[PDB]
RNA sequence: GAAAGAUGGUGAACUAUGCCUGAGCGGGGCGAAGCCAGAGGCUCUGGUGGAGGCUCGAAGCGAUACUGACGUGCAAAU
RNA sequence: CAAAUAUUCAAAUGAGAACUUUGAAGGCCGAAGAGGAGAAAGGUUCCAUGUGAACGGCACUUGCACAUGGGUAAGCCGAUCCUAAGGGACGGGGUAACCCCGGCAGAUAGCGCACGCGCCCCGAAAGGGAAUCGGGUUAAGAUUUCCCGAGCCGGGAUGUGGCGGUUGACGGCGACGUUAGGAAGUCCGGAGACGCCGGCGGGGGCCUCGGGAAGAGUUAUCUUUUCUGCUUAACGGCCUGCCAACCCUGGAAACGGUUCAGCCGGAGGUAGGGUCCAGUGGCCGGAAGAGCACCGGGUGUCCGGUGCGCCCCCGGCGGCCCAUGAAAAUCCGGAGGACCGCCGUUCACGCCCGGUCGUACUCAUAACCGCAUCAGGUCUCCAAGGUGAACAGCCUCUGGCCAAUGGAACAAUGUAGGCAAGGGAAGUCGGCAAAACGGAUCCGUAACUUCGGGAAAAGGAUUGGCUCUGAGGACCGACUCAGAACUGGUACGGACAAGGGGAAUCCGACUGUUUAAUUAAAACAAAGCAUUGCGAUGGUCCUCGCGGAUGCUGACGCA
């Protein structure tokens, strides 16, 4: 597993081709947002309420999304 | 003190006859004796093994005697080999 | 291999995986998982085993 | 224990050596007095010739104690 | 006080078959097989170690398992020899040149 | 031990199944002589050394 | 009878030397042309220790003569020898300890050790720590050389074999008394199975010429011939004399 | 109905010894070299240090005495 | 039918219960176990259901018996691969043949890119070694094979992106750093890769003290109390950076630095500033969604302290040797630069694949051997609290057990274990057996001596409980050691544990060894002493023969 960063760099993984899910964390802390890639679990926190659903909006429409 | 005269010889104990302790003596003092270095110009030369001699220090190795550095005939053979060598010439 | 090729030329299925044991009446026993798509209880239904 | 009881000369079965061995103390108390000497030649209460001559007379067995050394100490620069 | 047991068929404690104590997520404690502990390089000429790669097993050193910063040092006979070697060689290598030059001209 | 050879396990299956009582209707056959299998084994008696 | 414990060795059996932790065998190298007509020079690497022998061995790195290789080597080494030294073998090699030269090349009392029998043997003679050999005379006729070897005999060898200049490392090792059968029991532990001897007379005659009686004595001269069978000659063999002068 | 003799074979899973490669042996007592300081002029005093086919002893290994028990034994040696 | 402390009550089932099952009670093993798991060996003994007889030396409803079925899943655990001591073996040699010989060298049977080079196999489930973790699941498996999730290794194809062309990258004085960043034959180094003993330091786990919250126990009295639990894997990123090692500046006597001990410095110390190294260290991801504990979906899964503590691993010193304590496979690095340009790329991401055999169970006072369900024998890992020097003995927790035919009664004689007035070896071949001594602290200790010992010589005194007091530290704490008062039927190492001492003679120096199953010794060995042979065309020895051991040896050696 390994975690990103910068919420542009996990734009772009989740809309890689291998990318399968994004299963959505809520912490009592921040939102995780983790998807499922072909060798690796990338996950990103969101510490930030609006960033969290601004990232929900924005998701790449072909990608599955599931709530944990 | 400790000793009047054992010495390092007092590891062994009433152990294998006065005369062979004293004999030893010689041999262990001088197996576990520091050696000067003429190379380094230090008092490092430990005994590694029988006829084996390293320097702590600047780390070389030399063949010499069983219990002690320098063998009395080995200065002896050096001088003979060393006239002979001139005296060739 | 043979058991994977066996029984996709036997009942037109797919394995996953195929693990093997050698019983202690000495036969050999076969432990063959279907891939997902294909129903294990469906082929089951044909070969008659149900 | 901690206030003292039940150890009398009735309830030791082991030697003073096994019960706390004479190594260990004379390890306290040079780390002890080492560490006191260090933090006097910081702060420059000593210089590096009494630390040195300290240092010597520590491992030397001439004080068995920190009140001892900072006494000694205090007496050595006593001198003028 | 949840004493352990070993995980594989090996009954003998052997070099090989060093253990370590971890506690799980399940609240337990489990061994775990530990590597051997390995030298690193070492220089021929001084014996000392050789500094910028770490201490693994063999196979650990492998292209496929490191990256290649790792396995080297950039110098000549980087992760042969160390520093003071290469300088003493380089200084070898051109006094006794030189000497070579004047030998021919005396 | 639980470490066997193949032909060591393949030995062992086959003694498991020879030591089986005779079936009932073999009493039954015309000329039979057979009472019972008079090659049973317990494991912990007569060992089968190998 | 039974066999005596003497004709057991030859068997092999349990008698076979200790080996498995030596370095190597200690000789020259082989003799080829640079030696035979001028020097090579090798360097010291190590001085280090063989198990079962008493002197110390010398690690030699030459340049092979023709090959782009490396050629090392190791032989017993002189007192005196260190790592990160020069040794010279060969015709023109200078008199000095360490360095490897015919016997041609050496003068009238020159001290030597690892001395070749014949030309290319690469050492048969004073190779046992502290020993050497003595270069008594020389033979421009015949090309043979005298020297006097560590028991006191004296040798001719041809003037082509090659010695070591100096004596064997390692010199006084036997003045030091052993004090225990343990220091006894580790020093063969690496050579043979032989330290342990039960005498001849503490056997039963089955056993041994020297065993039975109701005294431990052995009953019968213990000199024997020279042509006498195996499992007869014990005790002492062809002597001379006996007792102490 | 011998005690034997001979020919040809099988065993070092017990035990004997050599070799290779592994595993193991609490806690105490005595206190050798080396080293520090003090006093004296190398000696004395106090420490430090931890040697030895040293010692009391746990595990292990062994087997002295009761000539104990048993002696158609738990056991052809417990 | 008597070793290994031990059973009792109620109920159920059943024709039948001292022996089966459940509950309760009383006890034992006491964590170098009667606990939990393995290697050999066994081979179905493993699990379920059922029960004619036999068997389980009494009994049984019951089973390690019997009958019928079921059960062992791997790219990552092993074997397999490598070599060790060693074994076999082509040619050749010997031999009537069976067969016995491997260094005796025989065109060595092939390897890279025509050209170039050229010094067999077997043998370790404890040696070396590609790669896995946590949670769940069965009547029986998985202490890493199945399920869930998360990784890794090896191999093979193939892109997309990046990177380099001063053809083969930058930065740093430097140690060295950065995910990339040419290259053939040839050559060089390292890792693998190594003994024993003694301190010291570090990390993990465990033990231990406190606080908080959850639940349980006790509760006539007391007890902010007693007990239980309060968790965080491989793998990836960032940080940290021990003890050593290394780098730069600078230039030291009035020498300094420094360890428990050492030791270090003009061959450059102290000091200042840095590089690297390892971790079973910290934070984040994995991951709270899991697991656990509570309350009826919900709550919580937190904060500290301490150490000559115990186990494992690591680091770094010291000591010891007439002892110096494997090899190979495998992997990494380097020197060189022939050759080459739209071609190079050890980078990231992406795609495919991963064979065969073992795997149940016992591992022992009943699954192995001893003719047996035999008080014997049989290699390992883990290992808690108290007392205490302590893995001693004794008691307890976890876990496991009350299986050793039962009942009645206390004769002689036994066996095992005790006490005994007065005497104290008068007993007996003989103090055999037993008793006495015993821990710790203080005092004190002879002859003799190889000066090391003798020595714990001998001989005396003390020891409980309670209430205090003093000393010894770090940045608030832990044990130790001294002193005092009081006090008890003079008792106090209160059980346990734990030398009897002295004066001499003989033998053997000592430590070691030995007649498995009647002799442990004065016997054997031993160091020391002495003698003999031998310079390799040799001595000693083996072999039918060929040949071989000493010998990887050379007189400080072999015999
Ligand atoms: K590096
Ligand atoms: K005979
Ligand atoms: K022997
Ligand atoms: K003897
Ligand atoms: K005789
Ligand atoms: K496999
Ligand atoms: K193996
Ligand atoms: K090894
Ligand atoms: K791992
Ligand atoms: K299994
Ligand atoms: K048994
Ligand atoms: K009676
Ligand atoms: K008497
Ligand atoms: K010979
Ligand atoms: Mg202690
Ligand atoms: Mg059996
Ligand atoms: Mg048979
Ligand atoms: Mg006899
Ligand atoms: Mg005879
Ligand atoms: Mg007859
Ligand atoms: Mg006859
Ligand atoms: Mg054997
Ligand atoms: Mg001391
Ligand atoms: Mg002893
Ligand atoms: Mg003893
Ligand atoms: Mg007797
Ligand atoms: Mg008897
Ligand atoms: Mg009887
Ligand atoms: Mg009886
Ligand atoms: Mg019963
Ligand atoms: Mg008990
Ligand atoms: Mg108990
Ligand atoms: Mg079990
Ligand atoms: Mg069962
Ligand atoms: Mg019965
Ligand atoms: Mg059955
Ligand atoms: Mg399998
Ligand atoms: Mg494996
Ligand atoms: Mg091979
Ligand atoms: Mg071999
Ligand atoms: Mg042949
Ligand atoms: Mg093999
Ligand atoms: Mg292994
Ligand atoms: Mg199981
Ligand atoms: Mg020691
Ligand atoms: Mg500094
Ligand atoms: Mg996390
Ligand atoms: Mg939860
Ligand atoms: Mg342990
Ligand atoms: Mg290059
Ligand atoms: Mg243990
Ligand atoms: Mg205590
Ligand atoms: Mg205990
Ligand atoms: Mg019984
Ligand atoms: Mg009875
Ligand atoms: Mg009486
Ligand atoms: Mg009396
Ligand atoms: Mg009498
Ligand atoms: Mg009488
Ligand atoms: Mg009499
Ligand atoms: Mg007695
Ligand atoms: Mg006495
Ligand atoms: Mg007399
Ligand atoms: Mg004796
Ligand atoms: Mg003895
Ligand atoms: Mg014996
Ligand atoms: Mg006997
Ligand atoms: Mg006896
Ligand atoms: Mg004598």
Same mark, same amino acid.
Request: with cysteine; hydrophobic share 30%; aromatic share 8%.
């Given at each position: 597993?390994?975690?990103?960063?910068?919420?542009?760099?996990?734009?772009?993984?989740?809309?890689?081709?291998?990318?399968?899910?994004?299963?959505?964390?809520?912490?009592?802390?921040?939102?995780?947002?983790?998807?499922?890639?072909?060798?690796?679990?990338?996950?990103?926190?969101?510490?930030?309420?609006?960033?969290?659903?601004?990232?929900?909006?924005?998701?790449?429409?072909?990608?599955?999304?599931?709530?944990? | 003190?400790?000793?009047?005269?054992?010495?390092?010889?007092?590891?062994?104990?009433?152990?294998?006859?006065?005369?062979?302790?004293?004999?030893?003596?010689?041999?262990?003092?001088?197996?576990?004796?520091?050696?000067?270095?003429?190379?380094?110009?230090?008092?490092?030369?430990?005994?590694?093994?029988?006829?084996?001699?390293?320097?702590?220090?600047?780390?070389?190795?030399?063949?010499?005697?069983?219990?002690?550095?320098?063998?009395?005939?080995?200065?002896?053979?050096?001088?003979?080999?060393?006239?002979?060598?001139?005296?060739?010439? | 291999?043979?058991?994977?090729?066996?029984?996709?030329?036997?009942?037109?299925?797919?394995?996953?995986?195929?693990?093997?044991?050698?019983?202690?009446?000495?036969?050999?026993?076969?432990?063959?998982?279907?891939?997902?798509?294909?129903?294990?209880?469906?082929?089951?239904?044909?070969?008659?085993?149900? | 224990?901690?206030?003292?009881?039940?150890?009398?000369?009735?309830?030791?079965?082991?030697?003073?050596?096994? +019960?706390?061995?004479?190594?260990?103390?004379?390890? +306290?108390?040079?780390?002890?007095?080492?560490?006191?000497?260090?933090?006097? +030649?910081?702060?420059?209460?000593?210089?590096?010739?009494?630390?040195?001559?300290?240092?010597?007379?520590?491992?030397?067995?001439?004080?068995?104690?920190?009140?001892?050394?900072?006494?000694?100490?205090?007496?050595?620069?006593?001198?003028? | 006080?949840?004493?352990?047991?070993?995980?594989?068929?090996?009954?003998?404690?052997?070099?090989?078959?060093?253990?370590?104590?971890?506690?799980?997520?399940?609240?337990?404690?489990?061994?775990?097989?530990?590597?051997?502990?390995?030298?690193?390089?070492?220089?021929?000429?001084?014996?000392?170690?050789?500094?910028?790669?770490?201490?693994?097993?063999?196979?650990?050193?492998?292209?496929?398992?490191?990256?290649?910063?790792?396995?080297?040092?950039?110098?000549?006979?980087?992760?042969?020899?160390?520093?003071?070697?290469?300088?003493?060689?380089?200084?070898?290598?051109?006094?006794?040149?030189?000497?070579?030059?004047?030998?021919?001209?005396? | 031990?639980?470490?066997?050879?193949?032909?060591?396990?393949?030995?062992?299956?086959?003694?498991?199944?020879?030591?089986?009582?005779?079936?009932?209707?073999?009493?039954?056959?015309?000329?039979?002589?057979?009472?019972?299998?008079?090659?049973?084994?317990?494991?912990?008696?007569?060992?089968?050394?190998? | 009878?039974?066999?005596?414990?003497?004709?057991?060795?030859?068997?092999?059996?349990?008698?076979?030397?200790?080996?498995?932790?030596?370095?190597?065998?200690?000789?020259?190298?082989?003799?080829?042309?640079?030696?035979?007509?001028?020097?090579?020079?090798?360097?010291?690497?190590?001085?280090?220790?063989?198990?079962?022998?008493?002197?110390?061995?010398?690690?030699?790195?030459?340049?092979?003569?023709?090959?782009?290789?490396?050629?090392?080597?190791?032989?017993?080494?002189?007192?005196?020898?260190?790592?990160?030294?020069?040794?010279?073998?060969?015709?023109?090699?200078?008199?000095?300890?360490?360095?490897?030269?015919?016997?041609?090349?050496?003068?009238?009392?020159?001290?030597?050790?690892?001395?070749?029998?014949?030309?290319?043997?690469?050492?048969?003679?004073?190779?046992?720590?502290?020993?050497?050999?003595?270069?008594?005379?020389?033979?421009?006729?015949?090309?043979?050389?005298?020297?006097?070897?560590?028991?006191?005999?004296?040798?001719?060898?041809?003037?082509?074999?090659?010695?070591?200049?100096?004596?064997?490392?390692?010199?006084?090792?036997?003045?030091?008394?052993?004090?225990?059968?343990?220091?006894?029991?580790?020093?063969?532990?690496?050579?043979?199975?032989?330290?342990?001897?039960?005498?001849?007379?503490?056997?039963?005659?089955?056993?041994?010429?020297?065993?039975?009686?109701?005294?431990?004595?052995?009953?019968?001269?213990?000199?024997?011939?020279?042509?006498?069978?195996?499992?007869?000659?014990?005790?002492?063999?062809?002597?001379?004399?006996?007792?102490?002068?």
């Amino acid at each position: 597993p390994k975690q990103i960063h910068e919420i542009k760099d996990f734009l772009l993984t989740a809309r890689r081709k291998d990318a399968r899910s994004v299963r959505i964390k809520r912490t009592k802390d921040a939102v995780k947002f983790k998807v499922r890639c072909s060798r690796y679990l990338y996950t990103l926190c969101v510490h930030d309420t609006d960033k969290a659903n601004k990232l929900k909006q924005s998701l790449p429409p072909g990608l599955n999304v599931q709530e944990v | 003190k400790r000793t009047k005269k054992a010495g390092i010889v007092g590891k062994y104990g009433t152990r294998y006859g006065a005369s062979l302790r004293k004999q030893i003596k010689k041999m262990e003092v001088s197996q576990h004796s520091k050696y000067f270095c003429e190379f380094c110009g230090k008092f490092a030369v430990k005994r590694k093994a029988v006829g084996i001699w390293g320097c702590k220090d600047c780390g070389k190795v030399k063949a010499g005697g069983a219990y002690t550095m320098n063998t009395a005939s080995a200065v002896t053979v050096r001088s003979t080999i060393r006239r002979l060598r001139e005296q060739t010439e | 291999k043979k058991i994977k090729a066996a029984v996709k030329k036997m009942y037109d299925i797919q394995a996953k995986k195929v693990n093997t044991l050698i019983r202690p009446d000495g036969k050999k026993k076969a432990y063959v998982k279907l891939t997902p798509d294909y129903d294990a209880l469906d082929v089951a239904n044909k070969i008659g085993i149900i | 224990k901690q206030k003292g009881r039940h150890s009398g000369y009735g309830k030791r079965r082991g030697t003073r050596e096994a +019960r706390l061995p004479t190594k260990i103390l004379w390890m +306290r108390r040079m780390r002890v007095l080492r560490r006191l000497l260090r933090k006097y +030649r910081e702060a420059k209460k000593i210089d590096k010739h009494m630390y040195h001559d300290m240092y010597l007379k520590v491992k030397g067995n001439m004080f068995k104690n920190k009140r001892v050394l900072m006494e000694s100490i205090h007496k050595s620069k006593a001198e003028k | 006080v949840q004493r352990l047991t070993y995980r594989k068929r090996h009954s003998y404690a052997t070099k090989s078959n060093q253990t370590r104590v971890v506690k799980t997520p399940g609240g337990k404690l489990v061994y775990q097989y530990t590597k051997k502990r390995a030298s690193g390089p070492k220089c021929p000429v001084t014996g000392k170690k050789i500094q910028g790669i770490p201490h693994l097993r063999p196979t650990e050193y492998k292209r496929s398992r490191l990256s290649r910063n790792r396995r080297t040092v950039n110098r000549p006979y980087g992760g042969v020899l160390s520093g003071p070697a290469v300088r003493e060689r380089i200084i070898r290598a051109f006094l006794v040149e030189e000497q070579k030059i004047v030998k021919k001209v005396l | 031990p639980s470490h066997k050879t193949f032909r060591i396990k393949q030995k062992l299956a086959k003694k498991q199944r020879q030591n089986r009582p005779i079936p009932y209707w073999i009493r039954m056959r015309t000329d039979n002589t057979i009472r019972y299998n008079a090659k049973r084994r317990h494991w912990r008696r007569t060992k089968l050394g190998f | 009878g039974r066999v005596i414990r003497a004709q057991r060795k030859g068997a092999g059996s349990v008698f076979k030397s200790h080996t498995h932790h030596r370095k190597g065998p200690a000789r020259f190298r082989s003799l080829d042309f640079g030696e035979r007509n001028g020097y090579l020079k090798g360097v010291v690497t190590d001085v280090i220790h063989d198990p079962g022998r008493g002197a110390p061995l010398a690690k030699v790195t030459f340049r092979h003569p023709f090959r782009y290789k490396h050629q090392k080597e190791l032989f017993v080494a002189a007192e005196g020898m260190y790592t990160g030294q020069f040794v010279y073998c060969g015709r023109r090699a200078t008199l000095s300890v360490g360095n490897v030269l015919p016997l041609r090349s050496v003068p009238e009392g020159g001290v030597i050790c690892n001395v070749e029998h014949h030309v290319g043997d690469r050492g048969v003679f004073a190779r046992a720590s502290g020993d050497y050999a003595i270069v008594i005379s020389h033979n421009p006729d015949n090309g043979t050389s005298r020297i006097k070897l560590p028991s006191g005999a004296k040798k001719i060898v041809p003037s082509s074999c090659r010695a070591m200049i100096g004596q064997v490392a390692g010199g006084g090792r036997t003045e030091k008394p052993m004090l225990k059968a343990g220091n006894a029991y580790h020093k063969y532990r690496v050579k043979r199975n032989s330290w342990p001897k039960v005498r001849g007379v503490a056997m039963n005659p089955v056993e041994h010429p020297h065993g039975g009686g109701n005294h431990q004595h052995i009953g019968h001269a213990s000199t024997v011939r020279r042509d006498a069978p195996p499992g007869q000659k014990v005790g002492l063999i062809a002597a001379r004399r006996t007792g102490r002068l």
